[PDB]
Design a protein around this motif. Structure first.
Motif, PDB file in Angstrom:
ATOM      1  N   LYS C   3       0.823  -1.200   0.000  1.00 27.29           N
ATOM      2  CA  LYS C   3       0.000   0.000   0.000  1.00 27.29           C
ATOM      3  C   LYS C   3       0.864   1.260   0.000  1.00 27.29           C
ATOM      4  N   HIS C   6       2.323   1.605  -3.601  1.00 27.94           N
ATOM      5  CA  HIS C   6       1.308   2.103  -4.524  1.00 27.94           C
ATOM      6  C   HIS C   6       1.025   3.582  -4.286  1.00 27.94           C
ATOM      7  N   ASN C  26     -15.293  21.375  -8.442  1.00 25.10           N
ATOM      8  CA  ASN C  26     -15.624  19.968  -8.245  1.00 25.10           C
ATOM      9  C   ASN C  26     -14.431  19.066  -8.534  1.00 25.10           C
ATOM     10  N   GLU C  30     -11.660  16.703  -5.946  1.00 27.62           N
ATOM     11  CA  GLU C  30     -11.213  15.332  -6.155  1.00 27.62           C
ATOM     12  C   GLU C  30      -9.691  15.235  -6.123  1.00 27.62           C
ATOM     13  N   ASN C  37      -5.391  11.772   0.606  1.00 27.05           N
ATOM     14  CA  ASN C  37      -5.574  10.363   0.917  1.00 27.05           C
ATOM     15  C   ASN C  37      -4.269   9.600   0.736  1.00 27.05           C
ATOM     16  N   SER C  40      -1.740  10.462   3.519  1.00 33.95           N
ATOM     17  CA  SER C  40      -2.309   9.900   4.737  1.00 33.95           C
ATOM     18  C   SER C  40      -2.026   8.404   4.838  1.00 33.95           C
ATOM     19  N   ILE C  41      -2.194   7.692   3.718  1.00 31.55           N
ATOM     20  CA  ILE C  41      -1.821   6.282   3.626  1.00 31.55           C
ATOM     21  C   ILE C  41      -0.336   6.086   3.910  1.00 31.55           C
ATOM     22  N   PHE C  44       0.501   6.701   7.750  1.00 33.53           N
ATOM     23  CA  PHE C  44       0.076   5.527   8.511  1.00 33.53           C
ATOM     24  C   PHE C  44       0.995   4.336   8.237  1.00 33.53           C
TER      25      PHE C  44
END
Ligand SMILES: *[C@@H]1O[C@H](CO)[C@@H](O[C@@H]2O[C@H](CO)[C@@H](O)[C@H](O)[C@H]2NC(C)=O)[C@H](O)[C@H]1NC(C)=O
Ligand SMILES: *[C@@H]1O[C@H](CO)[C@@H](O)[C@H](O)[C@H]1NC(C)=O
Ligand SMILES: [Fe+3]
Ligand SMILES: [Fe+3]
Lengths: 679, 31, 48
Positions: C3, C6, C26, C30, C37, C40-41, C44
Motif C-alpha cells: 500500500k 502504490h 468539483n 477530487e 488520501n 495519509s496512507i 500511517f
C-alpha cells in the motif's frame, strides 16, 4: 495497481449528461475506497455490446429481445440486474404490449395492411417481436428476409435501427433510421409521438406510456387500443385487452470478466436513495433532458438476477421459440400425426450407458442426452435439449414449479390393473442397527446419520420436515455430529463423512459410492448410525439379493427401524410406524411434448417391460444391477395419469404442505431462479 | 533471550466491506 | 508495504504531469482528496 472502477455505456449526449450527474451523485455518497461510475459514450447499442465484449465497457440496459441478440456468440453477454414496474407493495417483472391508435379510425386488427405503423425499434420486445409474430403467418411467400416482407405488408412505416440502404420502406416515415435518442421517433414516447403527429396510423408501446405522455383525461379518451379478438376498448383495461406479457429490461454484463456484485452494490445504493422520491435534488428514473434515459421511466426498482439464471432461462421457452422462428422465418404447420423421437436425459456414464443400449434396442424412438446433476438436467429440459425424465417427487416439486408437467407415474405393486390404478405412494423410514438399541426419536442429537440425496423425498423432505418441527434451525450439521447427505456444500461435515474419491465426495450422481438408496444403506452398514431410506430397501439388500459382497453377508432381522414416539418396531411391520408417506416417482416433460411422450412410452413399456423374462442376455428396461438407474428397480409398470397432470394435484396436499414448511431452508439455486421468475 | 513477546500490537481488524482499516497503534485510522 | 509503494508511485504519477493553472471547484475537490488520501496512507504506513 489499478483499483476497482465501474463504467457505464452511453447512447447519446443525453445519456452523457444524465450519466455525468449520476457520476457526481454516486461519488458524493460512496466512501473514497469504494468504486464509482464512469461514462463511456458509444454511438449505438449494438456497438455498445461489442464494446462490452471487447472489455471497453461493463454494463448497459437492453430489452428482452435485444438480450436475445446480446446472448449470441461472440458477444456472450449475461443478464445480471432486472427492474420492477409496480409499487414497492407488489413488484411486477413482466409488462404488457399494446397497440394504440386514433379515435374513429375504425379499422380492425386483422386487415391492418396498407396502413402507417410506428415501431419503437428493430428487435425490441413490445415493438417488433409481438406485432410481427401475431401478424406473421398471414403474409405470402417469400417470407425471408423479414424486413422485405413486412415492408411489402405496410405501405411504408417507421422502424429505427433497421437498415435504410437495403430496405427503403422501413425508413419511409422516418428519414433517418438512427439507433439513438437523436431520432425523435426512437423509443417508447417516440413511437407514441409517431401516433400523436398523425403521420402514423398504429403504434405499438407498453401500457404505461400513454399515461406518461398525456396528462389530460380527454386526450386519453381520444386514443384507443385494439384487442386481439378484433374488438375495441379504451385505455385503462390494459389488463383486459393486451397482446402479450414481456420480461423487463435488464442490465447486462459479460460472463467471465464480471462482475455482478459491484454493479449490484452500486445499484442497491441507487435504488435506496433515488427510486421512490426520497431525494428531490436528483431523480434516477426521470430526467428533464429526456425520458427513458439510462433506465426506464416506469421502473420503480431493481431486482437481482440469481446466478443460475442465464438468458435462455430468463426469457422463458415460448419467447425464445417465437423469436427464433421469427428470426429464421418459419410458420409452423405441424400436423401432428407422427412423433419425432424423444430425447431422454441421463447422467454420468451409467445412466448414459443404459440409455444408449435402450436407444438401440428401440427402433429409434428414444435418443439420449446426458447431464451431470439432476438440477442441471431439469434446466436442460427447460431450455429445450432434453424431453423427458424420471425423477422423484421432491424434484417433481421443483420441476413442476419451474413449469413442467408430470405424465406417467411409476407403479410398485404387481397387479393386472396396475397400468390404470393410481397407487397410494411408498413409505419412508429410518433404519438403525441392532447393535445400538439406545436410539430413539427423542434423542438424535450428536449421533451420526445417512441420507440418500439432498432434496429427495425419503432422504430429505420426510426427514428434515419432521425434524424441522423439533430442531427449528435451518442448518443441520450442528444438530448431527456428522452424516452423509450428498448434494450439500463441500464445507459441511455432511459431505465430509461420505465415501467417494477423489473430488467426487458429496457429488449427487452414481459416481458417489454412498449415493441413493443402496448407497445410503451402505453408509449405514459401513459407517452409519441411522439411515433414511424407503421401506423396501432392507429386503432388497438382505441375504445375497445383491451379488455385492457386503450385501451378500447381511441379514434383515438385525437391521431395524425406529418410530416417532421412540418405540422400536421390527422390520416386517412398517405400517405401524412409518415416518411419513411419499408419492411415487413420476416422469416429467414439457407441455408441448406430452402427447408424444405419452404415446411412445406406452408403446415402450409393452415391449421391454416386466413380463419380459430371461432378463440376462436380452434387454430389460427396468432391471438394473441395483444402481437404481433411469427408473427404480422394483417397478412393475408405469401408470397412465388422466385428470391429474400438475405438480400440486399429483404430489398432494400433505406433501406440498411439508415442503412448504421446509421451503425457507432449501438451498437449491434452481428453486431460487424459478421463484424469482414469478411476480 | 525471552520466551515471550512484549508487544501484542500486530493484531488488527478491518470492516467487513473493506472500507476502513483499523490498527492497534496511534491514531488507529489513516483518515 | 504494497500500500505504501502504490501510494508513492501514484504520487510520482501525479508529479509527472501536465500542470493546470485554473480549476473548477468539483475537480479540484477530487484532486485534494486524492493526494491527501495518498500521503495519509503513507504516514500511517511507515509506522505500521
Ligand atoms: C397390491 O395389489 C393387490 C392386487 O394385486 C391389492 O389387492 C389385494 O391384496 C390382498 C393382499 O393384502 C390380496 O389378498 C387380494 O387378493 C388383492 N386383490 C383384491 C382385493 O382384488 C393390494 O391392495 C395392493 N397393495 C398392497 C399394499 O398389497
Ligand atoms: C408381454 O410381452 C409380449 C412380447 O412382446 C407382448 O406381446 C405382450 O403384449 C406383453 N404383455 C402385456 C403388455 O401385457
Ligand atoms: Fe422494452
Ligand atoms: Fe424415492
Amino acid at each position: 495497481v489499478p483499483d476497482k472502477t465501474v463504467r457505464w455505456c452511453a447512447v447519446s449526449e443525453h445519456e452523457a449528461t444524465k450519466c455525468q450527474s449520476f457520476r457526481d451523485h454516486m461519488k458524493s455518497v460512496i466512501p473514497s475506497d469504494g468504486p464509482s461510475v464512469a461514462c463511456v459514450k458509444k454511438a449505438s447499442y449494438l456497438d455498445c455490446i461489442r464494446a462490452i465484449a471487447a472489455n471497453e465497457a461493463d454494463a448497459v440496459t437492453l430489452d428482452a429481445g435485444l438480450v436475445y441478440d446480446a446472448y449470441l456468440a461472440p458477444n456472450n453477454l449475461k443478464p445480471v440486474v432486472a427492474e420492477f414496474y409496480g409499487s414497492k407493495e407488489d413488484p411486477q417483472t413482466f409488462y404488457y404490449a399494446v397497440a394504440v391508435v386514433k379515435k374513429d379510425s375504425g379499422f380492425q386488427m386483422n386487415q391492418l395492411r396498407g396502413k402507417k405503423s410506428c415501431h419503437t425499434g428493430l428487435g425490441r420486445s413490445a415493438g417488433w417481436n409481438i406485432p410481427i409474430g401475431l401478424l406473421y403467418c398471414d403474409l405470402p411467400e417469400p417470407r425471408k428476409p423479414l424486413e422485405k416482407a413486412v415492408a411489402n405488408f405496410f405501405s411504408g412505416s417507421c422502424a429505427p435501427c433497421a437498415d435504410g440502404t437495403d430496405f427503403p420502406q422501413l425508413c419511409q416515415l422516418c428519414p433517418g433510421c438512427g439507433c439513438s435518442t437523436l431520432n425523435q421517433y426512437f423509443g417508447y414516447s417516440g413511437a407514441f409521438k409517431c401516433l400523436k403527429d398523425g403521420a402514423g396510423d398504429v403504434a405499438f408501446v407498453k401500457h404505461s406510456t400513454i399515461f406518461e405522455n398525456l396528462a389530460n383525461k380527454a386526450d386519453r379518451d381520444q386514443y384507443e387500443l385494439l384487442c386481439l379478438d378484433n374488438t375495441r376498448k379504451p385505455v385503462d383495461e390494459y389488463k383486459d385487452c393486451h397482446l402479450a406479457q414481456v420480461p423487463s429490461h435488464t442490465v447486462v454484463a459479460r460472463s467471465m470478466g464480471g462482475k455482478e456484485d459491484l454493479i449490484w452494490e452500486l445499484l442497491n445504493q441507487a435504488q435506496e436513495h433515488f427510486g421512490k422520491d426520497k431525494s428531490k435534488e436528483f431523480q434516477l428514473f426521470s430526467s428533464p433532458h429526456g425520458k427513458d434515459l439510462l433506465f426506464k421511466d416506469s421502473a420503480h426498482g431493481f431486482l437481482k438476477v440469481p446466478p443460475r439464471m442465464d438468458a435462455k432461462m430468463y426469457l422463458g421457452y415460448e419467447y425464445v421459440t417465437a423469436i427464433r422462428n421469427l428470426r429464421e422465418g418459419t410458420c409452423p404447420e405441424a400436423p401432428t400425426d407422427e412423433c419425432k423421437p424423444v430425447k431422454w436425459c441421463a447422467l454420468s456414464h451409467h445412466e448414459r450407458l443404459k440409455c444408449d443400449e435402450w436407444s438401440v434396442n428401440s427402433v429409434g424412438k428414444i435418443e439420449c442426452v446426458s447431464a451431470e446433476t439432476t438440477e442441471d438436467c431439469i434446466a436442460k429440459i427447460m431450455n429445450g435439449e432434453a424431453d423427458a425424465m424420471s425423477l422423484d417427487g421432491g424434484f417433481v416439486y421443483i420441476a413442476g414449479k419451474c413449469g413442467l408437467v408430470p405424465v406417467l407415474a411409476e407403479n410398485y405393486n404387481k397387479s393386472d390393473n396396475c397400468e390404470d390404478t393410481p397407487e397410494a405412494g411408498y413409505f419412508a423410514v429410518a433404519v438403525v442397527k441392532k447393535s445400538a438399541s439406545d436410539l430413539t426419536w427423542d434423542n438424535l442429537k450428536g449421533k451420526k446419520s445417512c441420507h440418500t440425496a439432498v432434496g429427495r423425498t425419503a432422504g430429505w423432505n420426510i426427514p428434515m420436515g419432521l425434524l424441522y418441527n423439533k430442531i427449528n434451525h435451518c442448518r443441520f450439521d450442528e444438530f448431527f455430529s456428522e452424516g452423509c447427505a450428498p448434494g450439500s456444500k463441500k464445507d459441511s461435515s455432511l459431505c465430509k463423512l461420505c465415501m467417494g474419491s477423489g473430488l467426487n465426495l458429496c457429488e449427487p450422481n452414481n459416481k458417489e459410492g454412498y449415493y441413493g438408496y443402496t448407497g445410503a444403506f451402505r453408509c449405514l452398514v459401513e459407517k452409519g448410525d441411522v439411515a433414511f431410506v424407503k421401506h423396501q430397501t432392507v429386503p432388497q439388500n438382505t441375504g445375497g439379493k445383491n451379488p455385492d459382497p457386503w450385501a451378500k453377508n447381511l441379514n434383515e432381522k438385525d437391521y431395524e427401524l425406529l418410530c416417532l414416539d421412540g418405540t422400536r418396531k421390527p422390520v416386517e411391520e412398517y405400517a405401524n410406524c412409518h415416518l411419513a408417506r411419499a408419492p411415487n416417482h413420476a416422469v416429467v416433460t414439457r407441455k408441448d411434448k406430452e402427447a408424444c411422450v405419452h404415446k411412445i412410452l406406452r408403446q415402450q413399456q409393452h415391449l421391454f417391460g416386466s413380463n419380459v423374462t430371461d432378463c440376462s442376455g436380452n434387454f430389460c428396461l427396468f432391471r438394473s444391477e441395483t444402481k437404481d438407474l433411469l427408473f427404480r428397480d422394483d417397478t412393475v409398470c408405469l401408470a397412465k395419469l388422466h385428470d391429474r397432470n400438475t405438480y400440486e394435484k399429483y404430489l398432494g396436499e400433505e406433501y406440498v404442505k411439508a415442503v412448504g414448511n421446509l421451503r425457507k431452508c432449501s438451498t437449491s439455486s434452481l428453486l431460487e431462479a424459478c421463484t424469482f421468475r414469478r411476480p | 533471550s525471552t520466551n515471550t513477546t512484549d508487544n501484542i500490537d500486530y493484531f488488527d481488524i478491518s470492516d467487513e466491506s473493506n472500507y476502513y482499516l483499523i490498527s492497534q497503534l496511534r491514531p488507529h485510522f489513516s483518515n | 508495504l504494497q500500500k505504501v509503494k502504490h501510494s508513492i508511485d501514484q504520487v510520482t504519477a501525479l508529479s509527472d504531469g501536465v500542470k493546470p493553472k485554473q480549476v473548477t471547484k468539483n475537480r479540484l475537490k477530487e484532486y485534494y482528496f486524492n493526494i491527501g488520501n495518498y500521503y495519509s496512507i503513507f504516514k500511517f504506513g511507515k509506522d505500521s
